[PDB]
Write a protein that binds this ligand. Structure first.
Ligand SMILES: Cc1ncsc1-c1ccc(CNC(=O)[C@@H]2C[C@@H](O)CN2C(=O)[C@@H](NC(=O)C2(F)CC2)C(C)(C)C)c(OCCOCC[NH+]2CCN(Cc3cn4c5cccc(Br)c5c(=O)nc4n3C)CC2)c1
Lengths: 115, 104, 87, 150
């Protein structure tokens, strides 16, 4: 019924909260644009290119509904979010640049919280 | 570097442009071509100060920030009459009406 | 250079270049050297002549275009003059 | 898609410099892939920013408050080309030489409220001209017609 222990769900949302609440030297929250994916009516070109769309709202939902069974499964989707943003927006974009720093903020937070 | 002026005398106003390095004498030759009075029968002023023939427009104080196309500088003009020169007289423009309540 | 005289309702004579005064469509029609305006006063007509200088100087120009200023008291009479002169 | 004036989904990045050289607060407007206008962050007078766009993307610039049309490189629209050897493309936003009638119209619009346009002592013709506020959609209708007519 509950496939994940309380400490696993505790440390999972502790890492994602560090990525979501992260702010650069300017004071801008990098995750802001990545929290809500745009609808098919707004950006149909996003769904034509991206096969597995994902945002931070679906990642927090997947922690709440126990879909990811480990930290590696959580990373699988946080890296997919960043690769979808890079693939869609391409090199040079602020969204592409924000994705790279959010990838390192997830890995340094996983290193910190777990070990 | 162009300077945009308003040469004024009584109820006459000439709109003209000149270079900042141009002299007051060269501006008197422009007035001669328009109003047919030679430079020796003219006196040009910036406010109440008489302008020297040898001085440039920039040396008199007419620059690109102070004499723009949309807000040109005024040059006072007085012509020779009989033997002496007339007093500098620039007839002012008419006043606009009171600003309405809708704009107030 | 070719010049034209523009006379206001209160008798002020404004000597502007022919090329500058040609900015207005109404002046183009009556002019083919003098032009009289019985309903445009001097303070409005002087501001219309300042627009003709601003028009010719900054149209098709690579220098920065500054704002053409209009004071709140002259805005209404200048609008009626602009509509009547087509500029 | 389908309108004549629209951005092309090129997927080819292009680095542009937006430079506001007007005394107005500028509103960059991007025409999306269906030709619909999208507002972008405003540029204060004299401000310049390096922005990221793509090849074949249509842009136009307006006054953020008044919606008056502005020029970009002495023209209505801006489409960035390809970065030749990683060089940025420059978009110089300037003020157009407005007609005296249109400039008079702007100043009276900024001083009077829309409800009091009929209260003025001006002729009938000028009330409709004053109520005809500038907007992106009408200038697009005029431009789509102009390049389709050409
Ligand atoms: C500073 C400044 N001063 C004056 S203008 C200016 C400026 C100029 C440009 C940009 C950013 N650049 C752009 O928006 C460019 C300009 C124009 O050329 C269109 N454009 C695009 O990027 C478009 N993109 C393209 O054409 C392609 F990507 C080549 C296909 C355009 C407009 C995007 C369709 C800017 O920045 C600020 C944020 O603006 C971003 C606007 N939104 C973001 C959400 N996004 C919607 C959105 C939400 N999300 C996600 C949400 C959750 C999770 C993820 Br994982 C994603 C994700 O991955 N991607 C997106 N997006 C995209 C729609 C677009 C400020």
């Amino acid at each position: 019924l509950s496939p994940n222990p309380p400490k696993l769900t505790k440390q999972m949302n502790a890492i994602i909260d560090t990525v979501i609440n992260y702010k650069d030297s300017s004071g801008r929250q990098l995750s802001e644009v990545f929290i809500q994916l745009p609808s098919r009516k707004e950006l149909p070109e996003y769904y034509e290119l991206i096969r597995k769309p994902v945002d931070f709202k679906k990642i927090k939902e997947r922690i709440r509904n126990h879909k990811y069974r480990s930290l590696g499964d959580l990373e699988k989707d946080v890296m997919l979010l960043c690769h979808n943003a890079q693939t869609f927006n391409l090199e040079g974009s602020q969204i592409y640049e924000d994705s790279i720093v959010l990838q390192s903020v997830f890995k340094s937070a996983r290193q910190k919280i777990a070990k | 570097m162009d300077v945009f002026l308003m040469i004024r005398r009584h109820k006459t106003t000439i709109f003209t442009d000149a270079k900042e390095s141009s002299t007051v004498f060269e501006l008197k030759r422009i007035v001669e071509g328009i109003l047919k009075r030679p430079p020796d029968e003219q006196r040009l002023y910036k406010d109440d100060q008489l302008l020297d023939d040898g001085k440039t427009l920039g040396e008199c104080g007419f620059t690109s920030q102070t004499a723009r196309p949309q807000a040109p500088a005024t040059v006072g003009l007085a012509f020779r009459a009989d033997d002496t020169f007339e007093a500098l007289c620039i007839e002012p423009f008419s006043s606009p009406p009171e600003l309405p309540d809708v704009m107030k | 250079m070719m010049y034209v005289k523009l006379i206001s309702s209160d008798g002020h004579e404004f000597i502007v270049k022919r090329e500058h005064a040609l900015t207005s469509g109404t002046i183009k029609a009556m002019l083919s050297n003098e032009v009289n305006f019985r309903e445009i006063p001097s303070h409005v007509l002087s501001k219309v002549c300042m627009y003709f200088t601003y028009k010719v100087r900054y149209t098709n120009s690579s220098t920065e275009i500054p704002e053409f200023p209009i004071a709140p008291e002259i805005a209404l009479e200048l609008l009626m003059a602009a509509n009547f002169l087509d500029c | 898609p389908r309108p004549v004036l629209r951005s092309v989904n090129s997927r080819e990045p292009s680095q542009v410099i937006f430079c506001n050289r007007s005394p107005r607060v500028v509103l960059p407007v991007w025409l999306n892939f269906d030709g619909e206008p999208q507002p972008y962050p405003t540029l204060p007078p004299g401000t310049g920013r390096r922005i990221h766009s793509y090849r074949g993307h249509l842009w136009l610039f307006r006054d953020a408050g008044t919606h008056d049309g502005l020029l970009v490189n002495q023209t209505e629209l801006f489409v960035p080309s390809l970065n030749v050897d990683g060089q940025p493309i420059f978009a110089n936003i300037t003020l157009p030489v407005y007609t005296l009638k249109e400039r008079c119209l702007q100043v009276v619009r900024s001083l009077v409220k829309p409800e009091n346009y009929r209260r003025l002592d001006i002729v009938r013709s000028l009330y409709e001209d004053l109520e005809d506020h500038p907007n992106v959609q009408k200038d697009l209708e005029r431009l789509t017609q102009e390049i389709a007519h050409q």
